[PDB]
Amino acid sequence: QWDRLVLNTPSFPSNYWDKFVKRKVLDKHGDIFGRERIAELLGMDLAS
Amino acid sequence: GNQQSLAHSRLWDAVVGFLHVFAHMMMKLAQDSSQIELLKELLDLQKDMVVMLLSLLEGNVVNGMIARQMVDMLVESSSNVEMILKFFDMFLKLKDIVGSEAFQDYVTDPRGLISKKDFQKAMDSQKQFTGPEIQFLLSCSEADENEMINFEEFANRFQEPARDIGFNVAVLLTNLSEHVPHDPRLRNFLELA
């Protein structure tokens, strides 16, 4: 439950080697869970 | 002795013909809801043949010639086997897609129904079926009025009758895979199913 705070923070992959984990998760689960829901959960902007 | 006699008999031709007839008959009967009973009976008969095939595979060895003949018969009727597997897995995926949240936000009618156009849009958004598969699913899903489709009944209607035959097919495929290793032909059937 404590790890739910950094889900949508822009600095989530900070201090870690990979910075594109959120994009991979979006590509993996957008067609099932919903692209809009994934974007809101991870705090991403599709146009950006 | 009986197993050898059946292996050297003309049983494989009858099995291939039965597989072709079963595939086409089930594909045609799935569209109409007034023939469901017949379809159920059809499925039962199919299961019995699989049981007989299992009886032919009982008490064999690794790389046995009977299993090789069974694989040769299967690859001789590859198209019908692929059609049957597609029939099983399409309806298997339909129930999972219906319960997905994307479908729940796609349906807007509060009566529990959905239009054909919105159903097609939801399936295209899910990205799991091809266009002909969408057309076949639409044909099988009857619409009472204004293209309203009851997705719950449509998903739950084809589940129970086809469970036993699907389990028998899975068991037969697993047995053939485990008793005929290093056979590239069977890997395609394993991947499809």
Instruction: Answer whether B87's CB lies under 8 Å from B193's CB.
Output: no
| Distance (Å, whole) CA B136 – CA B133 | 5
Contacts of B100 in chain A (CB under 8 A): 32-33
Q: What is the 3-state secondary structure (H, E, C) of chain B?
A: CHHHHHHCCCHHHHHHHHHHHHHHHHHHHCCCHHHHHHHHHHHHHHHHHHHHHHHHHCCCCCCCHHHHHHHHHHHHCHHHHHHHHHHHHHHHHHHHHHCCHHHHHHCCCCCCCECHHHHHHHHHHHCCCCHHHHHHHHHHCCCCCCCCECHHHHHHHCCCCCHHHHHHHHHHHHHHHHHCCCCHHHHHHHHHC
Residue with tokens 């009472």: B144
What is the CA B77 to chain-centroid distance, rounded? 15
Residue of chain A minimizing CA distance to B123: A31
Beta-carbon separation of B126 and A32 below 8 A: yes
Chain A residues with CB inside 8 Å of B127's CB? Answer: 31
Name the token pair of B95: 């129930």
For residue B106, CA distances in Å to A45, B115, B141 come to 22, 10, 17
Q: Do A32 and B125 touch (CB under 8 A)?
A: no
Contacts of A34 in chain B (CB under 8 A): 101-102, 105
B69, B184 in Cβ contact below 8 A?
no
Q: Which residue is associated with the tokens 């991947």?
A: B191
Alpha-carbon gap: B178 to the closest alpha carbon of chain A (Å): 32
Q: Given A31, A32, A34, which is nearest B105 (Cβ)?
A: A34
In degrees and rounded to multiples of 5, residue B134 shows phi and psi of: -65, -45
| Cβ(A22)–Cβ(A13) below 8 Å | yes
Residue B160 CA to residue B189 CA, distance in Å, equals 24
| Nearest-neighbour CA in chain B from A35: distance (Å) | 9
Q: Can you tell me the distance from the alpha carbon of B44 to that of A6, in angstroms, rounded to the nearest whole number?
A: 54
How far is residue A48's CA from residue A40's CA, in Å, rounded to a whole number? 14
Answer for the pair B186, B180: CB distance below 8 angstroms, yes or no: yes
Taking the C-alpha atoms of residue B91 and residue B110, their distance in angstroms, rounded to an integer, is: 25
Radius of gyration of chain A (CA): 11
For residue A21, give the H/E element and its range. Answer: helix A21-33
Q: Report the C-alpha gap between A46 and A40 in whole angstroms.
A: 10
Q: Give me the count of residues in chain A.
A: 48
Phi, psi for residue B92 in degrees, rounded to 5 = -65, -40
Query: Which residue ranges of A make up the annotated binding site for caffeine?
Result: 17
Phi-psi region at B60: left, alpha or beta (left = phi > 0; alpha = psi -120 to 50): beta
SS (H, E, C) B162-179: CHHHHHHHHHHHHHHHHH
* Cα–Cα distance list, B95 to A24, B5, B120, B156 (Å): 26, 44, 15, 7
Q: Which residue of B has its CA nearest to A30?
A: B126
Tell me which method was used to determine the 3D structure: cryo-EM
With beta carbons less than 8 A apart as the criterion, state whether B19 and B46 touch. Answer: no
Cβ-based interface (< 8 Å): residues of A facing B: 31-34, 37
Give which of A27, A29, A31, A32 to mutate to test B binding, by max B Cβ within 10 Å.
Answer: A32
Spatial contact of B94 and B141, defined as CB atoms under 8 Å apart: no
Q: How far is CA B156 from CA A22, B16, B24, B151, in A?
A: 35, 30, 22, 8
